[PDB]
Scaffold this active site. Structure first.
Site, PDB file in Angstrom:
ATOM      1  N   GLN A   1       0.989  -1.090   0.028  1.00 49.85           N
ATOM      2  CA  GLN A   1      -0.065  -0.182   0.047  1.00 49.85           C
ATOM      3  C   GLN A   1       0.906   1.175  -0.030  1.00 49.85           C
ATOM      4  O   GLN A   1       1.865   1.301   0.800  1.00 49.85           O
ATOM      5  CB  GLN A   1      -0.806   0.168   1.244  1.00 49.85           C
ATOM      6  CG  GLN A   1      -1.712  -1.320   1.383  1.00 49.85           C
ATOM      7  CD  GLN A   1      -2.743  -1.341   0.210  1.00 49.85           C
TER       8      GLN A   1
ATOM      9  N   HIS B   1       8.564  12.745 -21.567  1.00 55.18           N
ATOM     10  CA  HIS B   1       9.557  13.547 -22.049  1.00 55.18           C
ATOM     11  C   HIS B   1      11.009  12.875 -21.610  1.00 55.18           C
ATOM     12  O   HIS B   1      11.540  12.791 -22.616  1.00 55.18           O
ATOM     13  CB  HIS B   1       9.429  14.868 -21.521  1.00 55.18           C
ATOM     14  CG  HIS B   1      10.590  16.018 -22.023  1.00 55.18           C
ATOM     15  ND1 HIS B   1      10.178  16.934 -22.608  1.00 55.18           N
ATOM     16  CD2 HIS B   1      11.758  15.671 -21.351  1.00 55.18           C
ATOM     17  CE1 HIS B   1      11.560  17.334 -22.865  1.00 55.18           C
ATOM     18  NE2 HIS B   1      12.647  16.889 -22.056  1.00 55.18           N
ATOM     19  N   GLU B   2      10.792  12.402 -20.435  1.00 56.00           N
ATOM     20  CA  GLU B   2      12.198  11.934 -20.232  1.00 56.00           C
ATOM     21  C   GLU B   2      12.451  10.516 -20.726  1.00 56.00           C
ATOM     22  O   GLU B   2      13.751  10.250 -21.309  1.00 56.00           O
ATOM     23  CB  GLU B   2      12.544  11.760 -18.646  1.00 56.00           C
ATOM     24  CG  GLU B   2      12.433  12.998 -17.661  1.00 56.00           C
ATOM     25  CD  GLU B   2      13.019  13.951 -18.225  1.00 56.00           C
ATOM     26  OE1 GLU B   2      14.171  13.909 -19.073  1.00 56.00           O
ATOM     27  OE2 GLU B   2      12.896  15.282 -17.829  1.00 56.00           O
TER      28      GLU B   2
ATOM     29  N   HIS C   1      13.817  10.823 -24.216  1.00 57.61           N
ATOM     30  CA  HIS C   1      15.315  11.045 -24.255  1.00 57.61           C
ATOM     31  C   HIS C   1      15.993   9.821 -24.472  1.00 57.61           C
ATOM     32  O   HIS C   1      16.814   9.608 -25.580  1.00 57.61           O
ATOM     33  CB  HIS C   1      15.910  11.625 -23.213  1.00 57.61           C
ATOM     34  CG  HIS C   1      15.649  13.224 -23.183  1.00 57.61           C
ATOM     35  ND1 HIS C   1      15.882  14.170 -24.386  1.00 57.61           N
ATOM     36  CD2 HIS C   1      15.009  14.059 -22.397  1.00 57.61           C
ATOM     37  CE1 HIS C   1      15.582  15.435 -24.036  1.00 57.61           C
ATOM     38  NE2 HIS C   1      15.253  15.487 -22.800  1.00 57.61           N
TER      39      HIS C   1
ATOM     40  N   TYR D   1      23.307  16.891 -27.937  1.00 56.86           N
ATOM     41  CA  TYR D   1      22.593  17.651 -26.946  1.00 56.86           C
ATOM     42  C   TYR D   1      23.107  19.249 -26.887  1.00 56.86           C
ATOM     43  O   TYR D   1      23.230  19.750 -26.223  1.00 56.86           O
ATOM     44  CB  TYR D   1      22.204  17.128 -25.734  1.00 56.86           C
ATOM     45  CG  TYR D   1      21.139  17.651 -24.697  1.00 56.86           C
ATOM     46  CD1 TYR D   1      19.872  17.196 -25.338  1.00 56.86           C
ATOM     47  CD2 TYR D   1      21.183  18.556 -23.653  1.00 56.86           C
ATOM     48  CE1 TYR D   1      18.842  17.727 -24.431  1.00 56.86           C
ATOM     49  CE2 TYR D   1      20.033  18.868 -22.805  1.00 56.86           C
ATOM     50  CZ  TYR D   1      18.928  18.457 -23.471  1.00 56.86           C
ATOM     51  OH  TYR D   1      17.812  18.975 -22.672  1.00 56.86           O
TER      52      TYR D   1
ATOM     53  N   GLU E   1      14.966  17.849 -27.642  1.00 56.02           N
ATOM     54  CA  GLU E   1      14.068  18.577 -26.810  1.00 56.02           C
ATOM     55  C   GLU E   1      12.576  18.496 -27.335  1.00 56.02           C
ATOM     56  O   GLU E   1      11.663  18.014 -26.663  1.00 56.02           O
ATOM     57  CB  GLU E   1      14.524  20.042 -26.253  1.00 56.02           C
ATOM     58  CG  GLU E   1      15.355  19.916 -25.333  1.00 56.02           C
ATOM     59  CD  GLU E   1      14.841  19.314 -24.044  1.00 56.02           C
ATOM     60  OE1 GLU E   1      13.551  19.430 -23.698  1.00 56.02           O
ATOM     61  OE2 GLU E   1      15.276  18.421 -23.567  1.00 56.02           O
TER      62      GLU E   1
ATOM     63  N   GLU F   1       0.629  11.962 -23.116  1.00 58.96           N
ATOM     64  CA  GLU F   1      -0.611  12.627 -22.185  1.00 58.96           C
ATOM     65  C   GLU F   1      -1.854  12.394 -23.050  1.00 58.96           C
ATOM     66  O   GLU F   1      -2.943  12.093 -22.301  1.00 58.96           O
ATOM     67  CB  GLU F   1      -0.192  13.990 -22.084  1.00 58.96           C
ATOM     68  CG  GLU F   1      -1.143  14.650 -21.214  1.00 58.96           C
ATOM     69  CD  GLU F   1      -0.585  16.133 -20.757  1.00 58.96           C
ATOM     70  OE1 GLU F   1       0.669  16.383 -20.071  1.00 58.96           O
ATOM     71  OE2 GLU F   1      -1.484  17.058 -20.958  1.00 58.96           O
TER      72      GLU F   1
ATOM     73  N   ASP G   1      21.960  27.249 -21.823  1.00 57.43           N
ATOM     74  CA  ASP G   1      21.096  26.201 -22.196  1.00 57.43           C
ATOM     75  C   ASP G   1      21.639  25.344 -23.287  1.00 57.43           C
ATOM     76  O   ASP G   1      20.817  24.704 -24.181  1.00 57.43           O
ATOM     77  CB  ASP G   1      19.417  26.635 -22.215  1.00 57.43           C
ATOM     78  CG  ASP G   1      18.397  25.535 -22.496  1.00 57.43           C
ATOM     79  OD1 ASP G   1      18.770  24.711 -21.731  1.00 57.43           O
ATOM     80  OD2 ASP G   1      17.629  25.914 -23.304  1.00 57.43           O
TER      81      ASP G   1
ATOM     82  N   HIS H   1      16.319  24.154 -25.077  1.00 61.94           N
ATOM     83  CA  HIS H   1      14.805  24.258 -24.346  1.00 61.94           C
ATOM     84  C   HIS H   1      14.216  25.538 -24.846  1.00 61.94           C
ATOM     85  O   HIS H   1      12.982  25.771 -24.530  1.00 61.94           O
ATOM     86  CB  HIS H   1      14.755  24.390 -22.840  1.00 61.94           C
ATOM     87  CG  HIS H   1      15.258  23.052 -22.343  1.00 61.94           C
ATOM     88  ND1 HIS H   1      16.770  22.707 -22.037  1.00 61.94           N
ATOM     89  CD2 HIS H   1      14.580  21.816 -21.883  1.00 61.94           C
ATOM     90  CE1 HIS H   1      16.769  21.624 -21.419  1.00 61.94           C
ATOM     91  NE2 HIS H   1      15.725  21.078 -21.425  1.00 61.94           N
TER      92      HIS H   1
HETATM   93  C1  LIG Z   1      13.212  24.434 -15.310  1.00 60.01           C
HETATM   94  C2  LIG Z   1      13.508  23.174 -16.179  1.00 60.01           C
HETATM   95  C3  LIG Z   1      12.716  22.057 -15.481  1.00 60.01           C
HETATM   96  C4  LIG Z   1      13.432  23.166 -17.627  1.00 60.01           C
HETATM   97  C5  LIG Z   1      14.365  22.381 -18.287  1.00 60.01           C
HETATM   98  N1  LIG Z   1      14.181  20.866 -18.233  1.00 60.01           N
HETATM   99  C6  LIG Z   1      13.181  20.093 -18.820  1.00 60.01           C
HETATM  100  O1  LIG Z   1      12.150  20.978 -19.622  1.00 60.01           O
HETATM  101  C7  LIG Z   1      13.005  18.602 -18.714  1.00 60.01           C
HETATM  102  C8  LIG Z   1      11.845  18.372 -17.467  1.00 60.01           C
HETATM  103  N2  LIG Z   1      10.415  19.038 -17.789  1.00 60.01           N
HETATM  104  N3  LIG Z   1      14.155  18.032 -18.078  1.00 60.01           N
HETATM  105  P1  LIG Z   1      15.387  17.553 -19.175  1.00 60.01           P
HETATM  106  O2  LIG Z   1      15.043  18.374 -20.669  1.00 60.01           O
HETATM  107  O3  LIG Z   1      15.262  16.023 -19.448  1.00 60.01           O
HETATM  108  C9  LIG Z   1      16.894  18.073 -18.461  1.00 60.01           C
HETATM  109  N4  LIG Z   1      17.972  17.273 -19.047  1.00 60.01           N
HETATM  110  C10 LIG Z   1      19.076  17.894 -19.170  1.00 60.01           C
HETATM  111  O4  LIG Z   1      19.577  18.927 -19.073  1.00 60.01           O
HETATM  112  O5  LIG Z   1      20.271  16.975 -19.756  1.00 60.01           O
HETATM  113  C11 LIG Z   1      21.506  17.269 -19.517  1.00 60.01           C
HETATM  114  C12 LIG Z   1      22.196  15.981 -19.125  1.00 60.01           C
HETATM  115  C13 LIG Z   1      23.098  15.685 -20.414  1.00 60.01           C
HETATM  116  C14 LIG Z   1      23.661  14.064 -20.010  1.00 60.01           C
HETATM  117  C15 LIG Z   1      23.352  13.418 -18.846  1.00 60.01           C
HETATM  118  C16 LIG Z   1      22.662  14.124 -17.881  1.00 60.01           C
HETATM  119  C17 LIG Z   1      21.880  15.220 -18.102  1.00 60.01           C
HETATM  120  C18 LIG Z   1      15.735  22.575 -18.194  1.00 60.01           C
HETATM  121  O6  LIG Z   1      16.517  21.577 -17.726  1.00 60.01           O
HETATM  122  O7  LIG Z   1      16.353  23.707 -18.538  1.00 60.01           O
HETATM  123 CA   LIG Z   2       0.787  18.608 -20.904  1.00 55.85          CA
HETATM  124 CA   LIG Z   3       2.949   0.790   2.498  1.00 57.32          CA
HETATM  125 CA   LIG Z   4      -2.565  18.141 -19.119  1.00 60.26          CA
HETATM  126 ZN   LIG Z   5      14.546  17.222 -22.214  1.00 69.38          ZN
END
Ligand SMILES: CC(C)C[C@H](NC(=O)[C@H](CN)NP(=O)(O)CNC(=O)OCc1ccccc1)C(=O)O
Ligand SMILES: [Ca+2]
Ligand SMILES: [Ca+2]
Ligand SMILES: [Ca+2]
Ligand SMILES: [Zn+2]
Ligand SMILES: [Ca+2]
Length: 316
Positions: A61, A142-143, A146, A157, A166, A177, A226, A231
């Site tokens: 649970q 999303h994750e 990747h 990236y 992205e 979704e 970035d 992004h």
């Molecule tokens: C405020 C934030 C939440 C916005 C945005 N993030 C996102 O939009 C999404 C979550 N919604 N996470 P992601 O794109 O998977 C981040 N991955 C990453 O940076 O890989 C870099 C990376 C490369 C290699 C190994 C490990 C990591 C941001 O990071 O600017």
């Molecule tokens: Ca959504």
């Molecule tokens: Ca439990």
């Molecule tokens: Ca939604």
């Molecule tokens: Zn991402």
């Protein structure tokens, strides 16, 4: 772990009750044996060592507050696996049923989630910018997307290839979704972003400029923040994908929509058959055109609409 497959029950981050596939061997573990070679969810215990510990529970649970991020990471990884299998005939992220691993409670107040090359990782948020990020089905998908990208096109990236990377994650996060069909939209992260502010999100695919992201190639970011705007410039591709599916007239260019399912087919084929690690936006347009041609024919509406959508966002 070796054990027998069981079904637990719990509550997710947003307070919704759901059943979860677990494994019993002394404890009940967040190990779903029903999908591929398993889905495994771990407790990072507010630290940054990964993966942490396979999540163990005494009674099957999962209604404690501490359990909620784990419930949702585990469950939404299952939904995402189902989407790729049922819709695209893809078995896990590598196409050969690789085990899917996620860790929750990563770090303290951590306002992000990521794929680290080997597994998914979710922060809890600081309670103001985010609540625990696995509460968002679009975020989870999303994750995991990747990982699909890394095993297929391998888009580097940074710069344009990274913005495509992205956008692919936003597109499939959104399509997952819609597949689950609970409050679906073309926004990213709305279920876990800013609990004190209603109606916002991290990004919008339908109107990227709502959150300062470009919706036309002439507005692309060319600086170094970035990873070269991965992004930020994703908004240009997100907008094109939104137009392909839903239609619209954007900067005076009209696009006839073809719907989500065909968007997903075209972009999945582009991702898995045409894109390469260094693809730029112009090459994505060519890959999408060729994918739509393979699926629907060179004279089809689907090909025409792909071209209109990339025209509308200034990508030739
Ligand atoms: C405020 C934030 C939440 C916005 C945005 N993030 C996102 O939009 C999404 C979550 N919604 N996470 P992601 O794109 O998977 C981040 N991955 C990453 O940076 O890989 C870099 C990376 C490369 C290699 C190994 C490990 C990591 C941001 O990071 O600017
Ligand atoms: Ca959504
Ligand atoms: Ca439990
Ligand atoms: Ca939604
Ligand atoms: Zn991402
Ligand atoms: Ca909010």
């Amino acid at each position: 772990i070796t054990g027998t497959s069981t079904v637990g029950v719990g509550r997710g981050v947003l307070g919704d009750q759901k059943n979860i596939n677990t494994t019993y061997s002394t404890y009940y573990y967040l190990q779903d044996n029903t999908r591929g070679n398993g889905i495994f969810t771990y407790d990072a215990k507010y630290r940054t060592t990964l993966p942490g510990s396979l999540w163990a529970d005494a009674d099957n649970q999962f209604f404690a507050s501490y359990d909620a991020p784990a419930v949702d990471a585990h469950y939404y990884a299952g939904v995402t696996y189902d989407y790729y299998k049922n819709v695209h005939n893809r078995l896990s992220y590598d196409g050969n049923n690789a085990a899917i691993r996620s860790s929750v409670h990563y770090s303290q107040g951590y306002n992000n989630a990521f794929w680290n090359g080997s597994q998914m990782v979710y922060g809890d948020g600081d309670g103001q910018t985010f609540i625990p990020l696995s509460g968002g089905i679009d975020v989870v998908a999303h994750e995991l997307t990747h990982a699909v990208t890394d095993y297929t096109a391998g888009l580097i990236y940074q710069n344009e290839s990274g913005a495509i990377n992205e956008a692919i994650s936003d597109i499939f996060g959104t399509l997952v979704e819609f597949y689950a069909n609970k409050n679906p939209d073309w926004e990213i992260g709305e279920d876990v972003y800013t609990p004190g502010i209603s109606g916002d999100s991290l990004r919008s695919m339908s109107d990227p400029a709502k959150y300062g992201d470009p919706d036309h190639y002439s507005k692309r970011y060319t600086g170094t923040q970035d990873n070269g705007g991965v992004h930020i410039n994703s908004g240009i591709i997100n907008k094109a994908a939104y137009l392909i599916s839903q239609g619209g007239t954007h900067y005076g260019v009209s696009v006839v929509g073809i719907g989500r399912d065909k968007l997903g087919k075209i972009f999945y084929r582009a991702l898995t058959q045409y894109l390469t690690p260094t693809s730029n936006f112009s090459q994505l347009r060519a890959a999408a055109v060729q994918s739509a041609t393979d699926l629907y024919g060179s004279t089809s509406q689907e090909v025409a609409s792909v071209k209109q959508a990339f025209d509308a966002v200034g990508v030739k």
